[PDB]
Amino acid sequence: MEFLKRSFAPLTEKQWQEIDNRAREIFKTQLYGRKFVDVEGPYGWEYAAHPLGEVEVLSDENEVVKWGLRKSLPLIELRATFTLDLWELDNLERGKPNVDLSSLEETVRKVAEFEDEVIFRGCEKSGVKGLLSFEERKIECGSTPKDLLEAIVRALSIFSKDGIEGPYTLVINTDRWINFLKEDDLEKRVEECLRGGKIITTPRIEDALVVSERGGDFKLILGQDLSIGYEDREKDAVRLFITETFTFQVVNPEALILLKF
């Protein structure tokens, strides 16, 4: 809302709409992590920590009054700035349909990459642990297209043993998917051996993983969703920024399996 000083920027309503639409379009396809995780609704710009429901005991064993500190996860706040050209933006009022927004597009891609890196690999200073860090959930087979089907069947067996149900999803690297596709018609067979679930191809990881989408196993906590605001003006250009505040945690590590090729 008001903390994004959007009413003090020398832009009209149509120019603001153009910027918003381009950013939204790129985010919707480049945020790969949000395709299979839960999103806990925005809490506000003031939210600072998320409880973990635990106490760390700081007193000795011989005291009468024993005390400790409660534990939580601190939220991460990011900010990335870029510049736009005022004359080029003003051509939009004359009626140009294709204005130049290359700086905005480049910054949006970098922000999305940062967030996906946090989800998949974690941040040691914040204390989050990523999906690929769970090395006790890893199974191994070969690189032949038949080995992929064997691995999927074994993964579903392990899920049933642990009691996990629901739709299943395969998240795989694009280069590996193309190599598998060349050898044979993997699709329509992968889905059948995965009981009608989706396939998601990403460049973020270099192998595959299988997840259950019943709900409540991977949480992305948001304080303020991605927003665009105003900073200052530099003699012919406008400086704007993209901001967000979030954190991530894995509740049930039993709904995830890592395939190693």
Q: Interface with ligand RBF by CB under 6 A: which residues?
A: 55, 57, 66, 68, 77, 79, 86-87, 90, 236
Q: Which range of residues in 10-18, 34-42, 135-143, 204-212 is near its own copies by CB under 8 A?
A: 10-18
> Smallest Cα–Cα separation from 120: which of 108, 134, 107, 109?
134
Give me the DSSP letters along 20-63.
HHHHHHHHHHH--GGGSSEEEPP--TT--EEEEEEEEE-S-TT-
30 binds, among ligand RBF, its own copies, none (CB under 5 to 8 A by kind): its own copies
**Of the ranges 34-42, 130-138, 186-194, 205-213, which one interacts with its own copies (CB under 8 A)?**
186-194
Q: Which C-beta is closer to ligand RBF: that of 38 or that of 90?
A: 90
96 makes contact, choosing from its own copies, ligand RBF, none, with CB < 5 to 8 Å by partner type, with: its own copies
Binding residue per annotation — 113?
no
- Confirm or reject binding of residue 12 to its own copies (CB under 8 A): yes
- Find the residue with minimal CB distance to ligand RBF: 90
Residue type at 6? Answer: R
The packing angle between helices 86-94 and 13-30, to 10°, is 110
Q: Does residue 39 bind its own copies (CB under 8 A)? A: no
User: Any contact of residue 41 with its own copies (CB under 8 A)?
Assistant: no
Backbone dihedral angles phi then psi of residue 197, each to the nearest 5 degrees: -115, -175
For the CB of residue 94, give the shortest distance to ligand RBF in the complex, in Å. 8
CB 119 within 8 A of CB 40: no
What length does the chain have? Answer: 261
**Nearest-angstrom CA–CA distance, 216 and 19:** 34
* DSSP label at residue 128: B
Residue 139 lies near its own copies (rule: CB under 8 A): no
- Binding-site residues, in ranges, read 79-81, 87, 90-94, 231
- Binding-site residues for FMN, in ranges, read 79-81, 87, 90-94, 231
